[PDB]
């Protein structure tokens, strides 16, 4: 009854106002694969993908143009999709760059299902909208530039900030928390991340000085895929140990939180497979008993987590602020969902253009 | 913007043309209370609850009753109304009765959800309809009953029965399984449930028997609580081990699943927290790779066995079926899910009348 | 030869000169069901259920008076009946509510046999009667009330305090503790509880800096149903979790003490089984090593822990003041077992009827 | 000193004499991407990926062709390589599509590593090259045509092989082995792969009736991704469980070898990470003391396989033929490694043409 009727999809490359320095790497514009997904209802689904790098946005796109046969014509249904996706894949593997191909589309067709009945995603979820406490997430600044940063995050009301670390030095990474304690006051949360940069040893030395600081989390402190190396950096700290942002589906949240990795959990909502993936996330949150905050796509993020559970932060990185609609405001430092049909995602179609790649 | 209005429940006893007689007793009648949710958009959402036995009937209903207060004029959001519900009933135990009061509640307000957007459940939670294959549920009918009433099941359709057994000597429960197969050949699916009837050295004894005979699953061998004694009579099994009709809650399902307590699943939309509570569920039970099945409540289970990704049989036994319209149908041994909105429940008011206590 | 004859049931809601508030919400009266159960003998038993909110208290006087038929004319012998109650509710599920009310029944038919053989329920269990130090609950009330009520308490005898706790920020709960410390001195015991307030991550930052304060337990950090979490939360601390007055049955407990969920235990007689599942729960406790208190039911906890090997604390917190006799005696914050048959309830018939529902 | 000087891909499609059928689909052609890795020392690397589907075709040369410029005027030298490659893929997700480039390029690098030394791979890697024994690979063929191709493999010399089941019933996979069985004779090996179409339950069932047959191993029976799942069908079986040729990159193996998922292993060139990856998976299978056979990249896993310690078999299923020279050869079914400089791939550049994409 209401079927997919194409896929249209625009790489663009966005400039951000502060690069995303991290400890292994910047990360200097948004390379985004903008989708539109037609239905035969008249409505038009619209999400979003985030490439990471340059390298990987064409590659995406025409993933994704190549896709456009297998779901064109069935139904606007994105669970029985999803599954469809998974099979197709089987052989290939159903992980990565593909696996966050099949998400965009669950996006979209979840923004579009929201458009058919004219209702808001979260209340099509079965939840009320309401404010979600949101951190500022800012990047490897240094000293000077992270306080500056962090000063004007609490004059537009954020009541938390995400530093990024792993600076050659610990007295480094100190000196940073300490300037923007001392600036912001002891009432703030401040989060730190990692971005995977220390082995083992090294994350448990580091992570007690900072514990001792009084930090919120610690975040991604070795390599992201070693689930077995997080509990173990975990089970010398009192303050939790945050990761997700890298699991590529619901499946691999399971294999970490059933080894107790980390005590706090932020899926990605591109990389945990998108609405049908976060749904399943949250159960499985719910039930270990785990904090549940998102980590970018803070359009769809804000959401999902109003029908999450265990929902704990909204991660504020405006990736594609260039290229939509400033539908979701912050006030007081929460996040306002748009009452608008769907995800409330709105292109500013002259803006695209300049990003065009 | 849709509000509760209203809460009206009618507590019913309707006769069984099959008894279910079990090893630990019979349920002679279907105890049900029926219940209607008003909301301010002029649409009422309908679900019942199964109360086992006379003696919690009126019990049941009273709660329901004194229950209307807390969700009157709240918003029609299920996901944000269960977890006030949780909440609310922290201190008191939020299991048992009040569990099952509370998953009546979230069963309407989604069939109530499914009529305000005009679209049947299973499409709202995101999935196309599809048939799901279902078996017909018989009970402790000794040998001769049991053949006949499998020999009707297979002429009209069903691949599978399932009969109750727990008889006094193993030799009675393999004579009726013996007789049943030989009626209809050894295509046909058998299963098998001792309804909490064993001990644990008896259960192994009699399971390894049956297995030989060739039987689809073996369903609660011993007392429902005891995850560990299943997971030991599975541990000595190569036939899967069934339960989940008596999970109080996705936690208790968890809780099993983290065990290795069975092989298999079939949760009871009521017991299991309603819709709501199943969504939490199947994620579960795709994550540990658990084949699910639905117990009861066949109206709204071929709805939400549709939307999960390890669907595996429909239960069969219709307890309501004097008091709602046959809008589910049977074809060929599979369920069909009526294009009605919401799940397809449309009382018979005269005969209710009949039933009313 | 000693049958029951008559189970009689009232409920009365008596109003509580300092309502019970918690952090998950305030209990303001106390809804109860008081018991007689008629025997051959002549002689009555008597006891009372805590129904937590007005709204389950009818429906738990329904469900006890539709029961009423199952146990009238069977022998007064209350290990006997609890297996037969047991088996009847095995389809339904012996918990919640029905267990409870299950309970009610035990508790009255040993206050009976004790009436029968003109002996103390103690003594008939087979131990002397010793004084049992008690503890004076509190709830959540505020740094002032807190205080004020601890003084009183420690002017009364008691020699430790329980508080609730779980305000908005840690740095209230610590100025609650601080400031009773400060009143009563350094002697004194501060019991702490949560009431299932906090996340594990959480319940770790808040109850390190309470066992800094030096509290003498941390009662329910988390949900109680997450054995799992409190094990968690527990690893990470020097002073003890205490749980329990949630566990419905032995079972309950068996599963929480199996992972090392705490390192003392309060069952409440009424949703531990009653005697019954008294007996057996001490049996655990004293194997597994843990201290056990009670919750609530000061009257037959008084007789259940002098024969209890581990006992710990008995908790004053009298809901049942108002319609009993004050037979039993709390002198220099021990409580004194009345030298009366059975457990020593005397109901205050002319106030019963000032609560009746 | 020797320095990589530029990458050149080239996509074709090629079209394959019998379709590799499986239970979750088909691979009718082989999409490939040959990469010339050119380099100042004149030699020219030479390696091939394969795309499983035509929808990933086009994306994976495009990685490629984007990735070049991080490795143009990089040293030769494969293990730094790849270590930096999976430092600037940190952040993106160092799996899946960018993962299978990775493993082009390192397996083009050690490629011309040899060429520059002038010496085979296998004995750059300090092995003597030796005779490899190879199974013929075949697909879900029905029972005609499975026996015929298992009866021209006997003919060449081949003395295993492997075909394909997950039929619509058990009758059907056993009625394939057992026609094979009959032609071929009790002596010959007889392997078959599942594709990851069983849930466990239906995969304990079907493999315990395929052991009886006597088949050598069962492959993939369930989701790959499920290593826990593996583990509970292997407990339940002497034949061993197969699985490996999804693993991406040695940590994947690494998680299912340590909880015991199967009893062999068959890592693929690209997918584990090429030549660097492989050699970090010959020395855990050689400690978890599992026999290794290879999947498909016949030509470099001669090899790789007479430089492992635990090898066991080749996969013999020649995807790229009709591009590359035949300069391996099977001889009595053993797979005889070429004696030419890196590992002997010769591009048929007037085939090449007629394939292009
Ligand atoms: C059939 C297969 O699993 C194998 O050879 O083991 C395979 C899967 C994908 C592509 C080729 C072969
Ligand atoms: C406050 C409590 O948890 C306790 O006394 O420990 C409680 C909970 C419900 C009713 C009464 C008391
Ligand atoms: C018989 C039963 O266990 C089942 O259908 O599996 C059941 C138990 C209680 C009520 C109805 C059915
Ligand atoms: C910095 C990061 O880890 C985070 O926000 O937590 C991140 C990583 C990649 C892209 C954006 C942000
Ligand atoms: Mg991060
Ligand atoms: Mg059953
Ligand atoms: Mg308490
Ligand atoms: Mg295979």
Redesign the interface.
């Known amino acids: 009854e209401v079927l997919i009727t194409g896929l249209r999809t625009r790489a663009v490359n966005v400039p951000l106002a502060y690069p995303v320095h991290?400890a292994?790497?910047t990360?200097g514009t948004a390379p985004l694969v903008l989708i539109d997904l037609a239905t035969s209802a008249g409505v038009v689904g619209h999400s979003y993908l985030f490439?990471?790098?340059?390298?990987?946005?064409?590659?995406?796109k025409?993933?994704l143009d190549?896709?456009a046969?297998?779901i064109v014509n069935e139904?606007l249904?994105?669970?029985?999709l999803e599954?469809m996706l998974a099979?197709?894949?089987?052989?290939?593997?159903y992980?990565?760059?593909?696996?966050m191909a099949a998400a965009g589309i669950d996006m979209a067709a979840?923004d579009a299902?929201g458009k058919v009945?004219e209702?808001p995603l979260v209340?099509?979820?079965?939840?009320?909208a309401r404010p979600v406490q949101a951190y500022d997430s800012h990047s490897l600044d240094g000293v000077k530039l992270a306080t500056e940063r962090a000063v004007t995050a609490a004059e537009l009301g954020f009541r938390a900030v995400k530093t990024k670390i792993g600076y050659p030095a610990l007295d480094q990474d100190l000196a940073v928390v300490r300037s923007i304690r001392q600036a912001v006051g002891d009432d703030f949360g401040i989060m730190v991340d990692y971005?995977?940069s220390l082995d083992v040893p090294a994350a448990i030395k580091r992570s007690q000085a900072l514990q001792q600081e009084g930090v919120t989390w610690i975040e991604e402190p070795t390599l992201q895929?070693?689930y077995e190396g997080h509990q173990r950096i975990q089970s010398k700290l009192?303050v939790?140990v945050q990761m997700g942002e890298?699991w590529?589906g619901?499946?691999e949240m399971?294999?970490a939180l059933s080894i107790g990795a980390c005590?706090?959990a932020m899926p990605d909502a591109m990389?945990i497979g998108g609405?049908?993936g976060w749904?399943?996330?949250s159960?499985?949150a719910?039930?270990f008993?785990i904090?549940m905050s998102s980590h970018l796509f803070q359009e769809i993020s804000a959401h999902l987590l109003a029908?999450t559970?265990?929902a704990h932060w909204l991660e504020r990185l405006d990736l594609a602020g260039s290229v939509i609609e400033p539908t979701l405001t912050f006030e007081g430092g929460n996040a306002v969902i748009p009452d608008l049909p769907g995800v409330g995602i709105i292109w500013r179609e002259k803006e695209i253009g300049k990003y065009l790649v």
């Open positions: 991290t292994v790497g990360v490439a990471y790098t340059p390298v990987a946005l064409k590659s995406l025409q993933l190549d896709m046969a297998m139904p249904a994105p669970v029985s599954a099979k197709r894949f089987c052989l290939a593997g992980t990565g760059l593909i696996r979840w299902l009945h209702t209340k099509l979820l079965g939840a009320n971005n995977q895929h070693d009192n939790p890298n590529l619901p499946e399971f294999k005590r706090l990389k609405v049908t749904i399943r996330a159960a499985l719910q039930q008993g904090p029908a559970p265990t």
